[PDB]
Design a protein around this ligand. Structure first.
Ligand code: CU1
Ligand code: CU1
Ligand code: CU1
Lengths: 336, 336, 336
């Protein structure tokens, strides 16, 4: 179990909402899984009205990519902070033990890189996020978080120990954004990242987000960018919120099996309408589609979903099943 | 299990906080249970100071009535939108599968009605609410939600599979209201429903309710309108919140058995002081009264309960039991 | 089980964050455990900038002391309200049955005392707080709450019934404070408790705390006042929030076994990154330290922790373990 004498393997990370290829149950024994992530500070457009955010990301996306390993593996991360950035960064992995989650061993100034190794000895979906001393909330709310999924080597199980399997996995990061507004009643635009700080902390202190989005922007997962699946497929929906609570719900569907605290050694709950993801954590739900059509996947504080942005869509192909639901009488004049 | 060849039965719905008569465990096999609900848009008085709300309700009450069926039954709902209303409505049942919870098949303009059938294949208390495309939050926060309770055909069970039974069931809907205030520091009064929209969405976006009430108004379940029970009775308290989290607690009592996510195939938790109902869901608690006296049942954010309105009372008859609690020394001068 | 014929014993309460000596599993049968608490109304400094609060406390601290008994014991509390106070007080124990948690039997004006006895028949960590008719929220948010821990007579157990034991127990109370600000943008200072009321209720109604602190002040458990432990020790962290939700997390660690609803007859959850304490309740987590260094224990709404005050530290002695985490490459220039 010395880590230095185990096999090493390299994973190529992909952008949300996809998750990189991986095996659910594995026969292999423990390995050292190597990942690389580059920090990118950039100004991004977060709504359809042209509102901008001075953002900070892991690999250029919000959320950062999901990293997948099995319980007992060692995560070996190379964190790269290019010289074109302006701030220092680091990473705090909630799935790791010690040193402020690794934050103490990964302080990197623009133009520096560092490599950390930690044992992933606890299964579940865990948040990771940047956490620079004295500036923690700002880097997290500007976009620096993602998920680490540690699968049990034997794959997911139901409460009676029966095997659960998914066909497809999607990762949704939910971000509460605090964009300052000026007297016009218009959101401010900033020339540089550093210039947005002072105003942004004042909005943060009110505890009221201006926008709450899935994966980086209002409408990121709606319409043309909907998630896709087919009747009969089992999807795993990973949902992370590194700062604020959320309450995910699939309209027209359910959470067949849900780990809302996100830790796979505990028995999941079944048949949930709406589940709860505590700020600072990631959770996961399984659902097998039974009806075709468009579904909405959203935070069920409906002001947060429809007014502030926390809603996405899943487009499902297949044949309607009239036993589950059937219009007996279409809308028509009442009888007189 | 074709639904069209099953027996059909009609249920007469009653107003909250009562729940219509039903059997807990049943010997009968699956049926098609027919319900009818009429939408009523009306201006209502929501506090003791004369504040009004331009409300929207299912059957004239907030919340709408609780509908009860057994797992495996088919719900057959006729939704009626009279010509005296002004808006279009529909219904989204969280206990249903497909078509945005039924919302896609029940779009009814004033003067129209529609009938939907869906299989209630998952046990638990589920929210239902109106959800018209582009106006979802407004119809929900104006009062359109209630609960569907799907009991397991064998009745409720504890974690070891031992039977649980209740003598009486009560249904509480908890509503976060967003009533606009003008410069006077007085709540606005609107001539029509449509006129309240613009101002109401501005209050909604602040995420801060002006009032949070049980069943339609401050004091709906207090004093003279308290709930009632007797020492030795087991009550089932159903609590729904279609938009915002809440944390119910009975002062002087406990949740003997609680399904806070509301789904009866999962084991309940025992001895809770305070439980958590996620916005967009309904949950249920069982309690057997052991002491007489007045109890308060409230959201335990005590500002939300005592300042904003989310508190009610339960008046219990019976004999005091000095073993459970006893005043040893009444209040008196300290000794000098 | 008559209480008057059982043995009586007196406990000497200590200030948070310590907890008074007690046995986990006990051979003794039920007893009447006598406690005394004195109310102290005082002006306290709650931050490092000199902000004051007109506070109200049980025994001069926030939170009040933790009282520990075993399931089946009888709690016998003498509540003392000295003549130097200005307000009436009482106590509501969530672990008690009847009479509004005991509040009805303990109304004490300045210069009076009362003694209440109640049977602690349900195991778990329970909140207790003051609750005077018509002034409930104000006494609770000004500081009057603490925890009652009722241990199972056989000690704590894991989900398979295997014994769990802790070496050390710490109690953290988390307080959402509502301190009024005047036009200067400076917090108001009040000559008397009664004078702070009117302004304080106006801030309360916005639902936005000015400060959220652990044990009475920003920095109460940081730096020099950190909690302490050693690698190999198992700590029990009791966390109470009598009014508002919170989401505790240990940076660099986990919740090995957590009862987030706080009731020990239910199976705990394992490997949590972040857990959830519902406003109006207390919960408990166990953790065995595996790495030395400084840990932060905080509410993982990172604005509430770092901007508003809800963060503390745990300083752990011992030897680093390179298998769990190891810096492979310290921060250095990227390669060119
Ligand atoms: Cu950062
Ligand atoms: Cu409607
Ligand atoms: Cu008090």
């Amino acid at each position: 179990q010395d880590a230095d004498k185990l096999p090493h393997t390299k994973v190529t990370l992909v952008a949300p909402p996809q998750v990189h290829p991986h095996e659910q149950a594995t026969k292999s024994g423990p390995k050292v899984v190597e990942f690389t992530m580059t920090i990118e500070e950039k100004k991004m457009v977060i709504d359809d009205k042209g509102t901008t955010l001075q953002a900070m990301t892991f690999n250029g996306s919000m959320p950062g990519p999901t990293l997948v390993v099995h319980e007992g593996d060692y995560v070996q991360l190379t964190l790269v902070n290019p010289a074109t950035n302006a701030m220092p960064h680091n990473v705090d992995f909630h799935g790791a033990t010690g040193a402020l989650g690794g934050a103490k061993l990964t302080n990197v100034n623009p133009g520096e890189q560092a490599t950390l190794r930690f044992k992933a000895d606890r299964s579940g979906t865990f948040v990771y996020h940047c956490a620079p001393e004295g500036m923690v909330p700002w880097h997290v709310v500007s976009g620096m978080s993602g998920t680490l999924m540690v699968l049990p080597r034997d794959g997911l199980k139901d409460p009676q120990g029966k095997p659960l399997h998914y066909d497809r996995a999607y990762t949704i990061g939910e971000f509460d954004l605090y964009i300052p507004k000026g007297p016009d009643g218009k959101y401010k635009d900033y020339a540089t990242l550093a210039e947005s700080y002072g105003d942004t902390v004042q909005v943060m202190r009110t505890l009221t987000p201006s926008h709450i989005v899935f994966n980086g922007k209002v409408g990121a997962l709606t319409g043309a960018n909907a998630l896709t699946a087919k009747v009969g497929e089992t999807v795993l929906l990973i949902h992370s919120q590194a700062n604020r609570d959320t309450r995910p719900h699939l309209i027209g569907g359910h959470g067949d099996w849900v780990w809302e605290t996100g830790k796979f050694a505990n028995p999941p709950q079944r048949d949930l309408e709406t589940w709860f993801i505590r700020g600072g954590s990631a959770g996961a739900a399984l659902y097998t589609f039974k009806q075709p059509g468009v579904y909405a996947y959203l935070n069920h504080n409906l002001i947060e979903a429809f007014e502030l942005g926390a809603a996405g869509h899943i487009k499902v192909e297949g044949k309607w099943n009239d036993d589950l639901m059937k219009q007996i009488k279409a809308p028509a004049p009442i009888p007189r």
